[PDB]
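Researcher: Last one for today. Full complex below.
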Amino acid sequence: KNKPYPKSRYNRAVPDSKIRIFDLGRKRAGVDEFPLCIHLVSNEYEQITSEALEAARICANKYLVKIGGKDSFHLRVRAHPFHVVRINKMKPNGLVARVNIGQILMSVRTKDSSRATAIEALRRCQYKFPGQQRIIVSKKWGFSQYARDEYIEKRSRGEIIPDGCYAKFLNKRGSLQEKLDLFPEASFNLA
Amino acid sequence: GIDIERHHVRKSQRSKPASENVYLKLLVKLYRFLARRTDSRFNKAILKRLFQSKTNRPPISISKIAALTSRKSASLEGKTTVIVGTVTDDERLLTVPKLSVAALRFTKSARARILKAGGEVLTLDQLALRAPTGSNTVLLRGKKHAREAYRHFGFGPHKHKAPYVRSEGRKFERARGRRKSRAFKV
Amino acid sequence: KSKNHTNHNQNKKAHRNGIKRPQKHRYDSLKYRDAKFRRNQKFANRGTVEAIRQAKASA
Amino acid sequence: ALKEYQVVGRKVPTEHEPVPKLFRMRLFAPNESVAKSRYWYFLKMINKVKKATGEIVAINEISEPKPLKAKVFGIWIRYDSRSGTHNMYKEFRDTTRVGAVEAMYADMAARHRARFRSIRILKVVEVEKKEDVRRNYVKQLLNPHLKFPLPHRRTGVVGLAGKKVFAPHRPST
Amino acid sequence: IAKRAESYDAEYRKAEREQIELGRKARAEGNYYVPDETKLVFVIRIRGIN
Amino acid sequence: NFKQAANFIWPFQLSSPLGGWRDRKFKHFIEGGDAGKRDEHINSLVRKML
Amino acid sequence: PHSYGIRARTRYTFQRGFREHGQIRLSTYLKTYKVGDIVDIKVNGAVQKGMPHKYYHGKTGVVYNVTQSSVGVLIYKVVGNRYMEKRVNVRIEHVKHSKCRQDFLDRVKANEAKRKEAKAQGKTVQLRRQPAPPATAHFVSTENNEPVTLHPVAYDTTI
RNA sequence: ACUAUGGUUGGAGACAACAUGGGAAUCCGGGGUGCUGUAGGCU
RNA sequence: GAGAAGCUCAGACGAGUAGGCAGGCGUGGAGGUUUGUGACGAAGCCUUGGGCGUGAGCCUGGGUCGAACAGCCUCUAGUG
RNA sequence: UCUAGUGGGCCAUUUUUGGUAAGCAGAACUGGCGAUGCGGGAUGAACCGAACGUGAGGUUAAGGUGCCGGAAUGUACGCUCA
RNA sequence: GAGUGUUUAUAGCCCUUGUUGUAAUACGUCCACUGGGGACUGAGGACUGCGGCUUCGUGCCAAGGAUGCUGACAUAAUGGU
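Model: Here's the assembly. Have a good evening.
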């Protein structure tokens, strides 16, 4: 119930977060690969600590690597611990993540065949988090906001150009030349 | 339970004079009847002022009566002057005009000067007999705040009132708090 | 322990006799006004009084 | 007891659209005031309309066309649980859809501790075909040669003999 | 006074009948008749002074 | 002259209703109580309270 | 941990608006104020001189005195169980007229014009305002606007 | 989304639902890319 | 007529510590008054009797007792 | 106009700060106890209902109707064996 | 006996419109429409008032607050302690 207590110039003694890396898998992924997404989201407002996030990250990384390999998961930890929960020294002690209801904690994108593997992995990862969490099968293509049917229609038209893990999407804004040169397959409808 | 605020419940007016004068009670009885049986506000005013205390019935002088009834735009030439209180004399008025005055009581000097000048002095019962409803009557009052206590009432910072002083002169409340040369001036 | 400030009963006490409004008067003292304005209004009001008195006397 | 009402409402006409659309809902409420409240409750979730900015143009109570005919009613509901939200389907044999809705509310309260506030009635339909019936318990009541013993009851009570403290003989069955 | 009361009673019945026929006409035509909003309301205090 | 007529009428001192209120008196009429707007049900409430 | 500075807790109160800094519009100096006018007090952060206290920011009062570059806005402030008269000398940069008074003047002019017109026409005038009346009776039609039946939507995942 | 009011509402709690009311931000999309007062010159 | 300090009609209201005000009950002494009470029994005291007042208190029956005492209008205080 | 007492507060809802926490300490709003009897929560200064002159009759609030205890061992649909 | 495989055969269900039919019933609302049963209260103390009926009268009435007809006891009852 305390007020937010981020690391600022007024209190610079905030200790380093236990968790350093946030993404595990093919960080340099592509649009075609990883078409399915699985989310682990808390069902209430908790104060998950960075230590618990570290344990969940280690368990998820080891399990996914050993059971699906390097090339079958792109798990990432959405939670970033910024709030400080003070503890009396035997004053900042550690970092915790403030998450509300419906805030995604863990998000992994895999293929359609690895749906059960991702479900099992994030089910076993619930024991490392305080409170109640739920697992949902996202309807969006990977980490992008567009749904499955919208994404496939956009891909069929040819309005998506992959750029690393993410991609560039055509919009009806900006100069025509800079978009026409970049997009060869874009069918600009004259209406 | 009933949620009613009780602010103006008990009336703060006298229903009876505090004095035990039997003649004053007789006058009150007469004007109680007059106020009840007449539709004139003069009788009600006289009855209300009969209940009033000494401080609430300040004296008036024949000079004040003469001044009030001799105004240029007055037309109070022969009208009877009525005051519920004592009529005092003012020796500063060397010549007394002819005045018809009705009052509770008259100073001996004031009554003698009025009679010598040719006027008449009446009591309240005589005034009631002559003017049962107060027609053609100039109703007057004395200065309520002319007493000593109102020089001190409301005393405070920058109020310009008279303090309660044992004596008058220097060394008596004429120092720090009263002039700029001594800290501050009130 | 000292320094026990609170404001629980202060509003109720103030509203017990209400928030009194200052008495309304038609004329306010000119000491709050400009010195030049007050000095000129003295002569303007004076001349107005003489004009009214002269008109009534002639009438 | 509950009653079924049809409620037709619309947004108050404005300068932008002088002719707003009319929306009708079939609701089960104890009275018309609750029915109108339920109508605005459901309309606020779909359209940018409130009670202040909208109006009710019609409300009519609906009675059962065939109250003397035994029927099967399929009720689709969406209810909030202590954890989340679930959609369920129920089948009830009754003569009125009001009675079927009342049975649904009693069953949900008894089996899930779900109050009135946590239940939304998505749809109520009348099942016509025998193969449409989904619950075996409901479908077993459609056998023309249906025969079962009298259900257990706490004997036969009387307004006076039931209140009698003592009985000369032990009752038999 | 009796004449006024008779006129008031006639006005009440006429207003009630007029609303009934208007509602029946709306039902027959299939349209919707919204009646006048109430101008009089009776209010009862149900809570005590605590 | 509704304002003068209503102000002249002393507030009605109704009795407790015959048959009582609902199970819980201090929730809204829509929620199942006796508070807030009740529309034409005020007539029945006045009937049992008069 | 409490200070009683003049401009304490005025960090956002005395801030200029976004993209509203720099030059002050000169129509404020051209506005004419008279004794008896009802004006609002809005402190301008650029004009430090003639600054009223933060309490009077957003208040409304009546001018009693007019000087070369300031006015005499009169305010009533609660100090307990009474109001006290506060006479603040405020530069015209922090003073603007109240639009309610202009609306009230127009309403009075319209009321008098209607009164004269109704007197000439020998009919009622109806100069008194009224609250919002209850809605009357209408006859909403359904042709080309047939009602659409709505049903509650089943719960589904939206992620 | 948020919020004023209410319950001897649910839940251990965190919180949530409901009832009488008020009501955003942001994103995206559509449209537009100065108006005007005074005094004077202009094939 | 109804102690005009009186008579009569009507409506609303009623918690209370600290504290404020008013009207009353009780005690000693003083002035006035009551053809006032009393050795055929004053005051006081007891009472398993009676009456009045919301109350402070008052009147009275019975027993003991033996020398003083009280009502009303005021005054006063070492007054509960 | 004059004057008394007071100038140790406390509890509950909601919004919080300091604290590991506290029947902890400190702020804001409202209602209360203090100074509030009465019906209910078996009991209780604050909770629910309701604010009180002496009584008669009727009806309720919160709360209850197996016995103690005044009031259905009432009605309808289900779940539960500890 | 145990099962068919076609739409009333020797049975009967469901859905449409015609009348009798302005069908009843249930529910809601209203009646200055009308019948009983039980309980508590009787304040005020010549008259005036508002109403209704009238034979038109200081007439009658349920109309600005209870009267009437009976009986038993009276070392009983009712009160007080």
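Chains F and A do not touch (no CB pair under 8 Å). The two ends of chain F are 26 Å apart (CA to CA).
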